[PDB]
Design a protein around this ligand. Structure first.
Ligand SMILES: NC(=O)c1ccc[n+]([C@@H]2O[C@H](COP(=O)([O-])OP(=O)(O)OC[C@H]3O[C@@H](n4cnc5c(N)ncnc54)[C@H](OP(=O)(O)O)[C@@H]3O)[C@@H](O)[C@H]2O)c1
Ligand SMILES: NC(=O)c1ccc[n+]([C@@H]2O[C@H](COP(=O)([O-])OP(=O)(O)OC[C@H]3O[C@@H](n4cnc5c(N)ncnc54)[C@H](OP(=O)(O)O)[C@@H]3O)[C@@H](O)[C@H]2O)c1
Ligand SMILES: NC(=O)c1ccc[n+]([C@@H]2O[C@H](COP(=O)([O-])OP(=O)(O)OC[C@H]3O[C@@H](n4cnc5c(N)ncnc54)[C@H](OP(=O)(O)O)[C@@H]3O)[C@@H](O)[C@H]2O)c1
Ligand SMILES: NC(=O)c1ccc[n+]([C@@H]2O[C@H](COP(=O)([O-])OP(=O)(O)OC[C@H]3O[C@@H](n4cnc5c(N)ncnc54)[C@H](OP(=O)(O)O)[C@@H]3O)[C@@H](O)[C@H]2O)c1
Ligand SMILES: COC(=O)C1CCN(C(=O)c2ccc(N(C)Cc3cnc4nc(N)nc(N)c4n3)cc2)CC1
Ligand SMILES: COC(=O)C1CCN(C(=O)c2ccc(N(C)Cc3cnc4nc(N)nc(N)c4n3)cc2)CC1
Ligand SMILES: COC(=O)C1CCN(C(=O)c2ccc(N(C)Cc3cnc4nc(N)nc(N)c4n3)cc2)CC1
Lengths: 233, 258, 248, 247
């Protein structure tokens, strides 16, 4: 039977490119969305036209709250209901905006930036593991140690996601679940800037990590940034 | 006039050693505590007996909630109310317990582990920096800094401690992000990262010795004073160009392979 | 035509598996060796039996010395002589043994451990770049920051190789050359190591309690040289089963 | 009795400030130098005027070669001959210049890798064999965002991080701590135009200035002190936040 994958924030941009490549590789896909229902269904339509009944959508707000654990349980359950299995979880959904230290309430910003970027991946990881070539791929940040000015909460959530990638790789290794990261990265600064950055390049690294060609790789974060993290101020 | 410091979780153990050494160095100190009221008051009493009116206590829960920003503002405000200034913030308080991925509510665990280790340090950092805006300038003798208590083992985490390790990773992120953003205000932001220091009071001696035997330098845990020494260096004039640095105080533990 | 690759220390073990997988992917290969002449020639024979004129051997000592630049130049020149091009360089050859701080001359140990692990990759990188989907892959070590006791010079060499990987990625990007690393943890154990000691190392690995096969290491090299990694440069991929994440 | 320290490349700039601060803390010092004899002797004379018989000089080339192990043994021996003990070794001497990928290259290898990595290793060996003991290595906070065309220098500083960690592990049972101090931008070249110096200064978040040599020395003094007794294998950045700044 065909393996199945959940991709969060899959309606647009990087998540969409990842869902497309997984589907092209032979996966059935759950396309998670929060607000982008039209785009999520448009993508499912396109994938189902290629292979009938191989793409479904799942709505969830990934902001931290009292109901986030049940929402994340539901996303994983939707994979099992549609496809009878869940082989791959891609934690792609992300919020991104500045939160200056010196001057939405700040606690709403915490619930969004830390909740979407770190807590929902944690809850999804728990639900994926509890329900069990299995693997999880977290979308990290190549610039995590040279943060953007005034992005403290965003940077904290991306740091927490490194910690989850490493902790979950160690704890889920006995279950045969690998846990890795892809870290995307102005153009004139990128060493490989002759090539334009694309969502498909990020998806290519995800496809490698979920493949049999990465069966010994766990706890690894692959930077896909054209060399930008190497460039000094 | 003597400078003033806030130390979170300062009633006992490492936070107390930090408060004691700051006080011996000449600081007035706010001893924040959550549940350890008797121990906090006992410490404040000892410090005030050494020099009158140089220590106060401040009670707060640092679990995340919609009131946490007000709590953290109030901790900083307590320093200014007692002492008229706040030169140093030490983010020491920390919840620590396992949260296995495979089997309190999990949302309570998130609020405790991520709140104490990361969100409260972030809000305290916001409040510390914001309160400096009103102060008179001291362009000649000002030495403002924040020290976060990190973990030397953050990249070799303990089994089944994902939320704890996520919170400590976020604290590294805060340390570096706040160092960049607050440098223009002359506020330095650094970390001290213990490996094995004081073992839990409830841990059996056999288990404590298992941890001690891992440490290359002396096969023993760091004393609380050894952790405090690195905090004292980072707040001192001898560290005036250091910002965004995390000093491991771990006896070589993080260098040891499986 | 078919692209061409140099793999150093390719007669046996991980370098052999890399040369084989590059050849299976469509590369012509230079099999570099130092002492393993019979194994190198046998491998070239096997690869040429599959596709004629797609494999050659090249012999060189990669110990540092005043002739090392000439040797490294000649390895790259051997790829151009055989195949007319050189698209990929894999720096795999490596000396590995203890050099305790407290008690071969020590200068010979320096020349061997720092030469093979760092200086030869640097000179090979210079000659590869000068002679021009181009890329270099360096075989690093996932344990570089939790080093084996009494392996100072080896560990220094591997740290220097990380610096080279990053510095050359930065400097050679304008020429379209990507430079990345693959960092094994425990892969193929030494032939001379007893079974009990091998099992000790295997038991450390979270993912499967086993060493990486040479083929698993080669799979990461194949990815990095591929069109699916064209925006990756300066990255070191650990292939370690989670070993580097395990505390004391 | 007073402890003793060897500082390499101690005639000028950061090494000089280290040697002065160690001497002010109460150490007797061996001032190693390569070409700067007049400045090394001037420093020793200044320190001996302050307290008699507390400073000597030791000349050596720290380029890698057949004779480097004997040179490094002789530097450590000079401390024992003058002062009867050697408590601290500071590996500060360093060659620094570009080596573009696209002097012979093997001379550049010998100089850049010898001064930054091989000589620290051999000095570490001789220091340990001869035994609050500690070694401090002068690292580089920018080691993972290197300057364009400085591959050999960067390789040498990466190797020095590996030495700092390997030696901390191996020498811990002997009670010898091994740590690093990693400057970002500190003293710029005297000949560098102020317009270029200002380009570097403006990069630094904390004060838009370079570190003084004395600020680097303050971190060394901490690491050799009793206040760092449990610290080994640590590298302390003294960089004003520079390493945290993205391109
Ligand atoms: N773009 C880059 O260059 C870059 C750089 C570094 C890292 N990354 C990482 O790569 C991943 C994808 O990047 P991207 O630019 O494609 O992401 P993006 O478009 O900024 O957002 C990704 C998706 O996350 C979902 N999302 C946002 N807030 C949410 C919430 N509160 N609850 C539920 N879903 C929410 C959105 O889904 P709906 O639209 O359905 O609401 C959105 O489509 C992210 O993890 C990002 O951090 C990207
Ligand atoms: N001990 C070690 O070996 C070690 C190792 C690595 C890192 N560290 C770090 O070093 C620091 C000091 O360690 P430690 O062992 O001394 O810490 P600890 O005893 O475990 O905790 C310090 C204090 O944290 C306060 N705290 C806990 N939950 C709280 C909450 N919800 N609200 C407010 N305060 C709360 C407690 O205050 P009350 O007692 O008043 O309730 C407690 O006394 C911590 O950040 C720790 O993570 C320590
Ligand atoms: N095996 C592991 O578990 C492991 C772990 C971490 C990293 N690695 C890295 O992965 C790579 C492959 O490892 P491996 O175990 O397959 O390597 P290996 O068998 O120890 O050595 C590979 C080859 O290096 C060549 N070599 C040694 N000294 C040389 C010299 N002076 N001049 C020229 N060539 C020389 C030898 O060639 P001849 O046989 O032709 O003389 C040898 O066959 C190495 O870079 C290694 O550091 C391996
Ligand atoms: N300056 C900075 O901004 C900066 C930044 C990052 C890291 N660092 C590190 O901090 C340390 C001190 O920096 P610095 O700028 O003061 O260094 P420096 O002036 O460039 O060099 C220090 C001394 O190294 C000695 N040296 C050079 N080549 C030598 C050789 N072949 N043999 C023996 N000694 C040799 C020279 O001694 P003689 O003059 O006696 O010949 C020189 O005075 C160095 O390790 C450096 O890499 C400095
Ligand atoms: C249900 O509760 C449990 O299961 C306990 C048993 C498992 N624990 C440890 O393995 C463990 C591992 C390392 C430790 N330390 C090196 C000491 C220690 C002691 N107190 C601490 N307190 C805080 N806040 N943070 C720390 N990192 C910390 N660390 C301590 C305990 C502690 C929690
Ligand atoms: C002359 O004496 C020797 O060669 C020593 C090297 C092997 N020893 C090990 O403890 C040891 C530790 C870890 C090992 N591995 C994880 C396997 C391994 C096997 N071959 C290798 N080859 C190279 N080049 N580099 C490596 N990192 C490497 N690694 C192997 C041996 C002790 C004996
Ligand atoms: C052809 O020769 C050249 O092109 C020279 C001019 C180019 N250089 C610099 O731009 C440069 C960049 C940064 C610098 N610093 C941050 C100051 C500095 C000054 N002296 C040093 N000395 C050593 N040993 N190590 C250092 N890192 C060091 N660093 C200094 C010069 C140095 C070599």
């Amino acid at each position: 039977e065909a393996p199945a994958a959940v991709v969060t924030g899959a309606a647009k941009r990087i998540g969409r490119a990842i869902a497309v490549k997984l589907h092209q590789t032979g996966y059935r896909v759950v396309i998670h969305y929060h607000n982008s229902a039209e785009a999520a269904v448009s993508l499912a339509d396109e994938l189902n036209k290629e292979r009938s009944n191989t793409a479904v959508v799942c709505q969830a707000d990934l902001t931290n709250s009292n109901v986030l654990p049940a929402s994340c349980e539901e996303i994983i359950n939707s994979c099992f209901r549609a496809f009878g299995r869940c082989d791959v979880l891609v934690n792609n959904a992300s919020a991104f905006y500045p939160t200056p230290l010196v001057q939405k309430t700040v606690e709403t910003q915490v619930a969004e930036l830390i909740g979407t970027n770190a807590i929902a991946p944690f809850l999804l990881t728990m639900s994926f593991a509890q329900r069990q070539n299995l693997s999880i791929v977290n979308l990290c940040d190549a610039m995590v140690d040279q943060p953007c000015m005034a992005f403290s909460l965003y940077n904290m959530g991306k740091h927490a996601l490194v910690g989850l990638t490493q902790s979950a790789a160690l704890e889920l290794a006995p279950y045969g679940i690998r846990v890795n990261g892809v870290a995307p990265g102005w153009r004139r600064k990128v060493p490989l800037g002759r090539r334009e950055a694309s969502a498909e390049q990020i998806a290519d690294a995800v496809i490698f990590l979920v493949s049999g060609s990465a069966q010994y790789i766990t706890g690894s974060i692959i930077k896909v940034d054209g060399g930008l993290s190497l460039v000094h101020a």
